[PDB]
Short mmCIF file of C-alpha atoms (C1' of nucleotides) in Angstrom, two decimals:
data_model
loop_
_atom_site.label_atom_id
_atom_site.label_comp_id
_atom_site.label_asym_id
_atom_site.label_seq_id
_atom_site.Cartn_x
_atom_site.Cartn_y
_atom_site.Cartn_z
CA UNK A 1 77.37 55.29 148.29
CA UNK A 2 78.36 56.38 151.78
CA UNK A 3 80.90 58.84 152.59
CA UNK A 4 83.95 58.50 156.16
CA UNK A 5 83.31 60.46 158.91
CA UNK A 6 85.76 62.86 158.28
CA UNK A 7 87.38 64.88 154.83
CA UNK A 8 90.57 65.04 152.90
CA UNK A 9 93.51 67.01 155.66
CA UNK A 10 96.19 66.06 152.57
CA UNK A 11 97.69 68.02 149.14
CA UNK A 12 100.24 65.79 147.20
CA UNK A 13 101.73 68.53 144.60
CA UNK A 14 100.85 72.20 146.44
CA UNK A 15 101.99 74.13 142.96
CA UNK A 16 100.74 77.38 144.04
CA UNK A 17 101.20 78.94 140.14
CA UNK A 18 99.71 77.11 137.51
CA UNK A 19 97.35 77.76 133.80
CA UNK A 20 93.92 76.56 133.07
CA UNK A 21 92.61 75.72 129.49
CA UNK A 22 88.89 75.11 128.37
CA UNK A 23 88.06 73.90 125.13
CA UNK A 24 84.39 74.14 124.46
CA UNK A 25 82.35 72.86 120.92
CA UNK A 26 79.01 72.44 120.05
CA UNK A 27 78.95 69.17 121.28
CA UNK A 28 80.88 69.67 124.85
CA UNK A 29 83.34 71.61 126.99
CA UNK A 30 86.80 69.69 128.50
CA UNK A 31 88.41 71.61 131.49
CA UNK A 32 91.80 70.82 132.04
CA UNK A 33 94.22 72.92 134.82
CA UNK A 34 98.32 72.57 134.76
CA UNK A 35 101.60 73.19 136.50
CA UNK A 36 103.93 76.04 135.24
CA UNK A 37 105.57 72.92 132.56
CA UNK A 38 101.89 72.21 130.72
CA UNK A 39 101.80 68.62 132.93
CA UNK A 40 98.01 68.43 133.86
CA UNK A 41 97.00 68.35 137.74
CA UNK A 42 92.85 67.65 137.18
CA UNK A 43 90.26 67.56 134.41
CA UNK A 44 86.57 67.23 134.51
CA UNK A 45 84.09 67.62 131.39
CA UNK A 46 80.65 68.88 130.95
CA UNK A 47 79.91 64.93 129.60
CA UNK A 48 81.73 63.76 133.50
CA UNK A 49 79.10 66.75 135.28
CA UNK A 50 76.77 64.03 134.56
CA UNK A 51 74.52 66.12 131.93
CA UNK A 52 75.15 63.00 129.18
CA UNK A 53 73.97 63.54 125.58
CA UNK A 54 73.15 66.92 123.75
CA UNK A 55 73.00 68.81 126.92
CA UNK A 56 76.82 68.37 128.08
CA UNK A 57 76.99 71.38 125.26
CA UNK A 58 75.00 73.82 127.30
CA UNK A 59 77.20 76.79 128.98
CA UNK A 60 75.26 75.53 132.39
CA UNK A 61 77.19 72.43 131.93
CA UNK A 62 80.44 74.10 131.00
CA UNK A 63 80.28 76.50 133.70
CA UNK A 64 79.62 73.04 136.25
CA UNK A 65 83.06 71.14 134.25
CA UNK A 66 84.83 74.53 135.62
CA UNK A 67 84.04 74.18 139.19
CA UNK A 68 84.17 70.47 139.15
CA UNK A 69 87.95 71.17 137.42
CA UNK A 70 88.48 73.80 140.34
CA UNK A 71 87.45 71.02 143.33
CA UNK A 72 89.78 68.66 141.70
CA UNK A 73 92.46 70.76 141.88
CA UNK A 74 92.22 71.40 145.45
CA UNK A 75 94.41 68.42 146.61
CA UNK A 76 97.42 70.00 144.12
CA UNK A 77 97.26 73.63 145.83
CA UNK A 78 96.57 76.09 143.41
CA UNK A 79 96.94 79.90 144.88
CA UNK A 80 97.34 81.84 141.40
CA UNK A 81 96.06 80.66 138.15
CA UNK A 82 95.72 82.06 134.44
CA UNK A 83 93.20 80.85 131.63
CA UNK A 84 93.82 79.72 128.17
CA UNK A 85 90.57 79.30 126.13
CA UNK A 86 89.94 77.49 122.85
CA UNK A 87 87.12 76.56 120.39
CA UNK A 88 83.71 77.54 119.02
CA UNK A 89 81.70 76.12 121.94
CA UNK A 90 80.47 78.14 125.95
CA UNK A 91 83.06 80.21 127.00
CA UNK A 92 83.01 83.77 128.67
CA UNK A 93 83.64 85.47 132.44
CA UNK A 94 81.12 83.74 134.22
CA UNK A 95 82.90 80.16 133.32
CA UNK A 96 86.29 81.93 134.53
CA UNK A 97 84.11 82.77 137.95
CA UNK A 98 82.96 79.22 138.38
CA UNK A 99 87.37 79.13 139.08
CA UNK A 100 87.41 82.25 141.28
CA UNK A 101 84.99 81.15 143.46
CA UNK A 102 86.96 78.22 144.72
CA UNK A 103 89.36 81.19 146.38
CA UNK A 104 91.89 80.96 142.89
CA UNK A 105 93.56 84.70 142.47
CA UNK A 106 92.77 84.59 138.46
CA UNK A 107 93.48 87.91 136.40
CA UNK A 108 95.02 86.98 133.15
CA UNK A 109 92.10 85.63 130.72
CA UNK A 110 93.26 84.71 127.38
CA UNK A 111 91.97 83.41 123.92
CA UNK A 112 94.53 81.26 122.27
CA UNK A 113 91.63 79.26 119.51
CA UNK A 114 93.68 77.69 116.56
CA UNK A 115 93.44 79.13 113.22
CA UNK A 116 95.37 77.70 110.27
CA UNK A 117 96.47 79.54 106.91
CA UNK A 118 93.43 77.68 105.75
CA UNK A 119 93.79 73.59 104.68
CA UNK A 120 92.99 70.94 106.67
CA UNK A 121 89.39 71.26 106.15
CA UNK A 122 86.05 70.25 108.12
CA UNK A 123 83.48 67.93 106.41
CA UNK A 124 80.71 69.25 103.98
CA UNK A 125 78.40 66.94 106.78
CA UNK A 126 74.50 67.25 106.08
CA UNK A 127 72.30 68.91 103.08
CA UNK A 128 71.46 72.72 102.92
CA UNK B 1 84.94 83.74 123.44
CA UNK B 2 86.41 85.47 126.11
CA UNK B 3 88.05 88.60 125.58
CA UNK B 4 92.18 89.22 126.00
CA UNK B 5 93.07 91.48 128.61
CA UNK B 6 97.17 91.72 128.17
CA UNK B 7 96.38 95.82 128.31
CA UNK B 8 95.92 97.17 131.47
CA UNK B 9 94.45 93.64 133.31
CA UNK B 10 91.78 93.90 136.08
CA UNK B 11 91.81 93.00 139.47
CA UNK B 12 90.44 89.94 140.72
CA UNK B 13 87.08 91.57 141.72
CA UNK B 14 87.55 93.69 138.56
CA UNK B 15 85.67 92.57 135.00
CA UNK B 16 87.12 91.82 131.88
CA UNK B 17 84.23 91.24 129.43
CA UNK B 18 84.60 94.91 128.59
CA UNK B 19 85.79 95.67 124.40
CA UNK B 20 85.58 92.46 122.13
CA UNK B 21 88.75 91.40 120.87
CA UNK B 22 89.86 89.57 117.33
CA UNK B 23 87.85 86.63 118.31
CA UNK B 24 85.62 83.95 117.04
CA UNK B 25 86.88 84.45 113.48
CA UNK B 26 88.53 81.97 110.76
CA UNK B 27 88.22 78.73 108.83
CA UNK B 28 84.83 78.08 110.47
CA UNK B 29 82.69 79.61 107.66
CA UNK B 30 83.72 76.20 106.09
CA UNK B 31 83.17 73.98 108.74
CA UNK B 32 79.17 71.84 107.75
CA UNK B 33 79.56 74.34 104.75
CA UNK B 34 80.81 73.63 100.87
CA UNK B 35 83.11 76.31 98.97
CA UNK B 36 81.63 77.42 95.03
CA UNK B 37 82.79 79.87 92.77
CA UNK B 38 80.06 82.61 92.31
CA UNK B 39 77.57 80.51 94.69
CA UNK B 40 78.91 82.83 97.73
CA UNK B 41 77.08 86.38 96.89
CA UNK B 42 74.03 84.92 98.10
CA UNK B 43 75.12 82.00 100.34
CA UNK B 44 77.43 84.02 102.24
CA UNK B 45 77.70 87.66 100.99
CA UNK B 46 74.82 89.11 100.60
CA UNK B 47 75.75 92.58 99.90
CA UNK B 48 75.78 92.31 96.54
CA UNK B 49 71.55 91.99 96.78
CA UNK B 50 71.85 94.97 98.92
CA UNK B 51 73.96 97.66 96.81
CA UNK B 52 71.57 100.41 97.30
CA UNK B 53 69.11 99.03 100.03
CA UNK B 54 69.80 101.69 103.07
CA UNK B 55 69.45 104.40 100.59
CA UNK B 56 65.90 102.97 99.04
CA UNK B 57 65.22 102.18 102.57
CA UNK B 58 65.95 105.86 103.70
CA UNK B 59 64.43 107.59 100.91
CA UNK B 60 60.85 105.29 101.34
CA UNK B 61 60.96 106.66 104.62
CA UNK B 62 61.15 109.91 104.01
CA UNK B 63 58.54 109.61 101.16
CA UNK B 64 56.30 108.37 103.74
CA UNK B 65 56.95 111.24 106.20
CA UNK B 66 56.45 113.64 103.22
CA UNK B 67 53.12 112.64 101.91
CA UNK B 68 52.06 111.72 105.89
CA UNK B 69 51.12 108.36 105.16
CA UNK B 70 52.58 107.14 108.55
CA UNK C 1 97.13 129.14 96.70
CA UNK C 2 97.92 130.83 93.43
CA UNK C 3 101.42 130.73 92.43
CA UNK C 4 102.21 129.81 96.38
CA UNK C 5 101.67 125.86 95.72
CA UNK C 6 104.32 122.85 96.82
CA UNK C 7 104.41 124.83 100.06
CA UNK C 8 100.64 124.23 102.25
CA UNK C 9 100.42 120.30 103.45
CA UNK C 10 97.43 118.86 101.93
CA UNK C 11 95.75 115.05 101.81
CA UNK C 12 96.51 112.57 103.56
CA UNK C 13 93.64 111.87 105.89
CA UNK C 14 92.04 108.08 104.48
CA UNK C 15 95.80 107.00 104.78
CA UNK C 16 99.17 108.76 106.21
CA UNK C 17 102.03 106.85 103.78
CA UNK C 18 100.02 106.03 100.29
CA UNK C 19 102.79 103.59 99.74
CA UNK C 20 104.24 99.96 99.80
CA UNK C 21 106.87 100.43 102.25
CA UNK C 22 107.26 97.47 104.88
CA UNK C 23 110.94 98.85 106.24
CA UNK C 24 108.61 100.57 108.90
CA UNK C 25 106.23 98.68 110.69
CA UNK C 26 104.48 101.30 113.81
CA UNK C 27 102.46 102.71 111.24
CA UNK C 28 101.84 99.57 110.22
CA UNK C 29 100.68 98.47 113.85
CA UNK C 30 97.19 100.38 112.72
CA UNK C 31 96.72 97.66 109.66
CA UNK C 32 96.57 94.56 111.72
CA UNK C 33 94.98 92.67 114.83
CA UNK C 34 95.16 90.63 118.32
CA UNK C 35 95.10 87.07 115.53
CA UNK C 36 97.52 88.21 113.09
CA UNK C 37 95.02 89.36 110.20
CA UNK C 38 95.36 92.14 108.43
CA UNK C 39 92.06 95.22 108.16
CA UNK C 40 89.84 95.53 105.47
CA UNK C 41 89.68 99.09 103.98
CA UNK C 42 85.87 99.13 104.97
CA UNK C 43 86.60 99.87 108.76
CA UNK C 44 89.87 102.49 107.79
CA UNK C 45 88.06 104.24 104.59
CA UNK C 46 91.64 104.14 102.99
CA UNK C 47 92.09 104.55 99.16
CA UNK C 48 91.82 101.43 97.02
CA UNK C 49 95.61 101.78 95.75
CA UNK C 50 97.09 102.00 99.07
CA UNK C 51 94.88 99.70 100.75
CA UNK C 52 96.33 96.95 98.00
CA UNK C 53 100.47 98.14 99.03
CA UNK C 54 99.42 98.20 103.31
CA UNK C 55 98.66 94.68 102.86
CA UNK C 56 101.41 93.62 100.80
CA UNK C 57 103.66 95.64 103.48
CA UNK C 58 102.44 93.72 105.87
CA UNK C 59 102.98 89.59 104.23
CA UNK C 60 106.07 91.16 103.52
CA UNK C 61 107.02 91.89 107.27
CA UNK C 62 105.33 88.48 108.09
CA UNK C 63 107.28 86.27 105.55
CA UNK C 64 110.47 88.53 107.31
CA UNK C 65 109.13 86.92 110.97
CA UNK C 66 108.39 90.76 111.65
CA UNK C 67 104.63 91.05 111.89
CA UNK C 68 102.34 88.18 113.55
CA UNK C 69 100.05 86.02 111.20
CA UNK C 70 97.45 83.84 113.35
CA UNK C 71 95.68 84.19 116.41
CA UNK C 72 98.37 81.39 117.64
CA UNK C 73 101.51 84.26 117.32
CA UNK C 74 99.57 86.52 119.86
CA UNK D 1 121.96 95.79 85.28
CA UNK D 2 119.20 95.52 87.74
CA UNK D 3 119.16 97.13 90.98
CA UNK D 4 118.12 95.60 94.39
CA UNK D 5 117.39 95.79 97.96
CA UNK D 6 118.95 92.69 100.15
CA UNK D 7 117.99 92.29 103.98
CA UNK D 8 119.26 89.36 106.00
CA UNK D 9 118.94 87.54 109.57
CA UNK D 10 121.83 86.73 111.02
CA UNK D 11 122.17 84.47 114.71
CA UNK D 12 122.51 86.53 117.65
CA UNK D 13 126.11 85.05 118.34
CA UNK D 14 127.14 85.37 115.12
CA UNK D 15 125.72 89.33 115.08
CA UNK D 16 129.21 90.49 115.60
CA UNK D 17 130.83 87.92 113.33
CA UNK D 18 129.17 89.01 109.96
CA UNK D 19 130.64 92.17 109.96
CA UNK D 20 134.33 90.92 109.30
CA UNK D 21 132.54 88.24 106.42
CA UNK D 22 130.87 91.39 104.74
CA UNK D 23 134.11 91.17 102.11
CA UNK D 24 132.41 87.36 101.03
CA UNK D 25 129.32 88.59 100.61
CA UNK D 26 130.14 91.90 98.27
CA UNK D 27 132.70 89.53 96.26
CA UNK D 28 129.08 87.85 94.96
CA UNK D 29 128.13 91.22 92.73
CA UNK D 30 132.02 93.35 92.69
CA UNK D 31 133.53 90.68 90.28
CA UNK D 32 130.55 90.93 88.22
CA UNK D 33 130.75 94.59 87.77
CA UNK D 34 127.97 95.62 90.32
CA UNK D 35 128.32 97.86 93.39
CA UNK D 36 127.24 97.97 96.94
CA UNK D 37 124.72 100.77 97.78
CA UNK D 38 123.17 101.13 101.38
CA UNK D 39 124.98 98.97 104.39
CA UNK D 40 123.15 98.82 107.86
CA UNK D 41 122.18 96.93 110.65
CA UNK D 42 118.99 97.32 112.87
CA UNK D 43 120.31 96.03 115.81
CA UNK D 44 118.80 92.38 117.70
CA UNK D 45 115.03 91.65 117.57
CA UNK D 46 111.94 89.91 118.19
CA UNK D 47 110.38 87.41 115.86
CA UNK D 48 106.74 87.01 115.43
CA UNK D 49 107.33 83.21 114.95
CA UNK D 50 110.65 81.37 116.29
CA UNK D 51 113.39 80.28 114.27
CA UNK D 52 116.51 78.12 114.27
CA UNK D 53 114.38 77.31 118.46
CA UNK D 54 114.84 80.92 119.12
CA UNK D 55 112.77 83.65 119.45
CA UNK D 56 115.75 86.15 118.43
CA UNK D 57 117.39 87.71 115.42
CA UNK D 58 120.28 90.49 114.02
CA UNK D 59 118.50 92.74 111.33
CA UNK D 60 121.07 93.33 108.12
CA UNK D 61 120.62 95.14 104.74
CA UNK D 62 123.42 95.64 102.12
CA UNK D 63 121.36 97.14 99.11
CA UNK D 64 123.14 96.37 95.76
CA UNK D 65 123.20 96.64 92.05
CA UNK D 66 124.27 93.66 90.08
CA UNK D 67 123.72 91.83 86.84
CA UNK D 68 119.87 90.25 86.60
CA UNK D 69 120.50 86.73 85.89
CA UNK D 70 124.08 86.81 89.00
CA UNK D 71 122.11 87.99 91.96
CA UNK D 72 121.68 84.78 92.30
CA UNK D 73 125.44 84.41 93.70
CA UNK D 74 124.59 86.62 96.41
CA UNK D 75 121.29 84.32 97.21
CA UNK D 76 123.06 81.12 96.87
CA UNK D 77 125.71 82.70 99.19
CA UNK D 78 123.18 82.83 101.82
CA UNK D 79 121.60 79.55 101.39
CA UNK D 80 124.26 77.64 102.65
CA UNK D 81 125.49 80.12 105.41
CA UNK D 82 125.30 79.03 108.63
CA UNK D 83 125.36 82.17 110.25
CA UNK D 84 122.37 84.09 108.52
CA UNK D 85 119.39 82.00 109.18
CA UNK D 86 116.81 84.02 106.59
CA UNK D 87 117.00 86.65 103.80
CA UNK D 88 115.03 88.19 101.01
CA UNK D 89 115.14 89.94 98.04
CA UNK D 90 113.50 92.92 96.27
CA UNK D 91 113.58 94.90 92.89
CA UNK D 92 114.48 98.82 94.18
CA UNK D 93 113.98 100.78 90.58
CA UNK D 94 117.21 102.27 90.51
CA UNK D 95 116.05 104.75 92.93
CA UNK D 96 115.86 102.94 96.69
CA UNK D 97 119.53 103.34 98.09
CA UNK D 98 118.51 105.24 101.04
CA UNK D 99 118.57 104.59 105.13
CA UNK D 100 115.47 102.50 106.28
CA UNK D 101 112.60 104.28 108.85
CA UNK D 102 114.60 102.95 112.47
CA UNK D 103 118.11 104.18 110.66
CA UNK D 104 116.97 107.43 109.28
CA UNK D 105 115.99 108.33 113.23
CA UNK D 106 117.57 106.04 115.29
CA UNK D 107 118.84 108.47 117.68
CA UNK D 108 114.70 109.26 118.55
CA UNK D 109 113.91 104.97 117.64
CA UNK D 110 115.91 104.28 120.56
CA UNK D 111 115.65 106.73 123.37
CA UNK D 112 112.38 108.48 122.46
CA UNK D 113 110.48 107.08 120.25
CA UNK D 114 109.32 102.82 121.00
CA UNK D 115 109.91 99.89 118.49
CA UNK D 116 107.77 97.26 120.28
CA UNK D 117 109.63 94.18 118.01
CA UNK D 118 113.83 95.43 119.12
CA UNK D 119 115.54 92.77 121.31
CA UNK D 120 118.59 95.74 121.39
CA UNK D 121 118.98 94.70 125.26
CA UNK D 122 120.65 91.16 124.23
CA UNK D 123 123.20 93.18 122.68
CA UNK D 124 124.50 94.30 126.25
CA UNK D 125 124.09 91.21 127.69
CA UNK D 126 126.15 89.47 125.10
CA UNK D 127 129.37 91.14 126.80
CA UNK D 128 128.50 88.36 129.76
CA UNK D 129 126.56 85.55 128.03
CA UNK D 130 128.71 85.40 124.54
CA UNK D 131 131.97 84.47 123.66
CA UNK D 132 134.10 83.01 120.91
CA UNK D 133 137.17 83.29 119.07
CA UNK D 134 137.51 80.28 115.99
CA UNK D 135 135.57 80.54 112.67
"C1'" U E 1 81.80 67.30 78.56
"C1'" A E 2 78.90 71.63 81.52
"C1'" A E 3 73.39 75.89 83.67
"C1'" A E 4 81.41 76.19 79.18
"C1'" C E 5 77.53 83.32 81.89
"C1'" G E 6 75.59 88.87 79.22
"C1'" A E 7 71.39 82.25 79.40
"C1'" U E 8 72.40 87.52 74.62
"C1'" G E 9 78.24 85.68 67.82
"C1'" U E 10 82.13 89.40 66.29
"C1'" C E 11 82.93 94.67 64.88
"C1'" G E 12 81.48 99.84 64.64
"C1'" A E 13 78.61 104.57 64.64
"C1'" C E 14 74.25 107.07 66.73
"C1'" U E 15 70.52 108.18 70.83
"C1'" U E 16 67.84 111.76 77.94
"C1'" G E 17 70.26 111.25 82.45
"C1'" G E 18 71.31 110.08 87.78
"C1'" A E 19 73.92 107.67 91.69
"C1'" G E 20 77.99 104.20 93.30
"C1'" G E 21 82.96 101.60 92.20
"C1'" U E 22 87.98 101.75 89.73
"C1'" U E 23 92.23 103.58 87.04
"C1'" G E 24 95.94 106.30 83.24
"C1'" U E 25 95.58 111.72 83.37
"C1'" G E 26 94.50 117.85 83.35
"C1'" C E 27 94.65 121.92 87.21
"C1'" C E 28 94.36 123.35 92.48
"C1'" C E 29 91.78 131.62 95.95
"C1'" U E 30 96.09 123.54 96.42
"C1'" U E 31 91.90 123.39 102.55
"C1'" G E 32 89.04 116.78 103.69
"C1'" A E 33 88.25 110.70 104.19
"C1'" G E 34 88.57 116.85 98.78
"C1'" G E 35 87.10 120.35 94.38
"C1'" C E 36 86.76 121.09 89.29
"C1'" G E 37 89.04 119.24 84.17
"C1'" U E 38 89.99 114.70 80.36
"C1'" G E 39 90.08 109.56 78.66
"C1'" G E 40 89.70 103.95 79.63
"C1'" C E 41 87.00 100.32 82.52
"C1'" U E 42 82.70 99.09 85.65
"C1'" U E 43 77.88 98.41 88.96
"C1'" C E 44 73.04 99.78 90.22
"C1'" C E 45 68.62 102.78 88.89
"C1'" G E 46 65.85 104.48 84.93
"C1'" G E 47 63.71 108.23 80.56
"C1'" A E 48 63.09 108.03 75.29
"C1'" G E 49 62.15 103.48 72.95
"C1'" C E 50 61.60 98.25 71.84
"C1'" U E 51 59.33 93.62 73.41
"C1'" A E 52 54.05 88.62 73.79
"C1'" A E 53 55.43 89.85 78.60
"C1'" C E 54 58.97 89.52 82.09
"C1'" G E 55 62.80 92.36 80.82
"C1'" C E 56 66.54 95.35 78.31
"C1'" G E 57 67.77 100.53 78.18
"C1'" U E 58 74.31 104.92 75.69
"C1'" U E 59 78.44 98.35 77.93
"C1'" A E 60 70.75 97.83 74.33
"C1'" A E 61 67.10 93.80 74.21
"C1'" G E 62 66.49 101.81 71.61
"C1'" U E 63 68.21 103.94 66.31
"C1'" C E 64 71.42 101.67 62.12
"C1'" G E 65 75.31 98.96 58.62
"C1'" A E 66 78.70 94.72 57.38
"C1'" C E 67 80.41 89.53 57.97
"C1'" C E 68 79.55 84.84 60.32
"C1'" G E 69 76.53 80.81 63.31
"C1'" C E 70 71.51 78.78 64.38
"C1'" C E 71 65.65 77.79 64.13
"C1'" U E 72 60.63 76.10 61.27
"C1'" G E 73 55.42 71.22 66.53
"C1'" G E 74 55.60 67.64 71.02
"C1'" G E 75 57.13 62.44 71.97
"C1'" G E 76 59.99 58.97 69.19
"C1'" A E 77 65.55 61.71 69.98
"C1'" G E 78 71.77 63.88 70.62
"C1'" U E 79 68.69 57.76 70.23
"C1'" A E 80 69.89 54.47 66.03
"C1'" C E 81 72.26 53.80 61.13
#
RNA sequence: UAAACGAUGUCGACUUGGAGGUUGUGCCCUUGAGGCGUGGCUUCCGGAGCUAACGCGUUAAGUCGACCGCCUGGGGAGUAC
């Protein structure tokens, strides 16, 4: 389970604010929002949405988480917000939203997936 | 997987999304997967397959159509 | 043209330096992307010879911290 | 003989220090027999990539001719550092003495133009947010 | 050691072409991401023609010469002595 009568009145940080980053693969998708000085404020997944298995790697979910990411977020008073996305997995303007919604706010897009010169790594997993 | 904008930026009510950007992506792919030396032109590019193919193709079609035979 | 040529201009269409580069850099701008890699010949129909000396440039720049390489540098 | 160009990075910072060291640097190829050529810089900036824990940063080229096996002097000179922080070599065929495209630009860039990245800003400012006066 | 590649020993002349790539280079009522000239290299298609056939085909597996290496059922076997 029940639940008070009730709710919640409440924030707590009230950032106003903040950035948020989604990463997500095949699988899944981790929502994480900061605050702002990198931190975080919430995260949530989705795995946490309660999808779970295969699924948390849906862009249902995620899009679900986020909203939830957000909420949360709510109770650290985000006004707002900017998004930082990474990773092969969903992605997205409807998961930007969901931010938003929630009333976030959110103008922003950016994303920032890493890309080495590369080395370093993936398996030869499984087979063809 | 999202598209940068940031140049611009929309509102909020707003796209975005619109043009996308240098996205998606790299090292992946390798990644699960795997690397081979000629292996590639049909693993992956491709093309090699292709190509003259389309040309086809073109001539087909003309064809067909044509004599249709279409 | 002829005995006149050079001049009459002639191009130069794609490619407008067909050269190596690096001093810069943009015309340069574009010859490279929003995650720091460089474009293939593909798009520009340059080219390639010059193709690649544009790039590179461009390694470079970047190897001179004035071009971006990955992405992330953008 | 080799003949080459040289283009350095020096601290923002130390921008306006480097000019009174250019004696270093000359040096290295004077004593080594070689000659300067390049002389500018291009004011700051923009890297991207920092270096460092700045993003900053002062473009420099002297560049020279250098003897083939004592450039490196000049290298080694450079590294120990610091500061010039970063510098590189090329590469010039006998080449190239001219600058470069934002010296031949200036400015039109800057006046205008833009850039794109730069740091001319900074810088400025810095006259603030600089100041020294020891080596 | 290799499916160590043209799956094709090295060298050289001759014998229909077309289309694409690349590069030293001739000239250019210089126009273009181009036009025509002259060599080197190269990829795809294919005539004559050869080949059991697939295939190869002016970079031959067509037309020819010199020098060199290899073959004479399968299994026993690149195994033993």
């Amino acid at each position: 389970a029940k639940a008070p009568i009730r709710a919640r009145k409440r924030v707590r940080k009230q950032v106003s604010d903040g950035v948020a980053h989604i990463h997500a693969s095949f699988n899944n998708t981790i929502v994480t929002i900061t605050d702002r000085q990198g931190n975080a404020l919430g995260w949530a997944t989705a795995g946490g949405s309660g999808f779970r298995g295969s699924r948390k790697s849906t862009p249902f979910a995620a899009q679900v988480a986020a909203e939830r990411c957000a909420d949360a977020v709510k109770e650290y008073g985000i006004k707002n917000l900017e998004v930082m996305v990474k990773g092969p997995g969903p992605g997205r303007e409807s998961t930007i939203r969901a931010l938003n919604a929630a009333g976030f706010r959110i103008t922003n897009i950016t994303d920032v997936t890493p890309i080495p010169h590369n080395g370093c790594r993936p398996p030869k997993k499984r087979r063809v | 997987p999202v598209i940068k904008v940031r140049e611009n930026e929309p509102f909020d009510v707003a796209l975005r999304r619109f043009k996308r950007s240098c996205e998606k992506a790299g090292v992946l792919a390798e990644v699960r997967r795997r690397e081979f030396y000629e292996k590639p032109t049909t693993e992956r590019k491709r093309a090699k397959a292709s190509a003259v193919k389309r040309h086809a193709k073109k001539l087909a079609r003309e064809n067909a159509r044509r004599t249709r035979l279409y | 043209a002829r005995y006149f040529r050079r001049r009459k201009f002639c191009r130069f269409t794609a490619e407008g330096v067909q050269e190596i580069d690096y001093k810069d850099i943009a015309t340069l701008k574009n010859y490279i992307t929003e995650s720091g890699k460089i474009v293939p010949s593909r798009i520009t129909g340059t080219r390639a010879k010059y193709q690649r000396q544009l790039a590179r440039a461009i390694k470079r720049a970047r190897y001179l911290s004035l071009l971006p390489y990955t992405d992330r540098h953008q | 003989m080799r003949h080459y160009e040289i283009v350095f990075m020096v601290h923002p910072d130390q921008s306006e220090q480097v000019p009174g060291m250019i004696e270093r640097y000359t040096a290295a190829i004077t004593g080594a027999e070689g000659k300067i050529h390049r002389l500018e810089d291009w004011g700051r900036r923009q890297l991207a990539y920092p270096i460092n824990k700045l993003h900053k940063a002062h473009y420099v080229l002297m560049n020279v001719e250098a003897p083939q096996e004592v450039i490196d002097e000049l290298e080694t000179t450079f590294r120990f550092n610091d500061a010039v922080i970063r510098s590189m070599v090329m590469r010039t065929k006998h080449a190239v003495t001219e600058a470069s495209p934002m010296v031949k630009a200036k400015d039109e860039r800057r006046e205008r133009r833009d850039d794109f990245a730069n740091e001319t800003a900074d810088d400025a400012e810095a006259g603030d947010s600089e100041e020294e006066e020891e080596e």
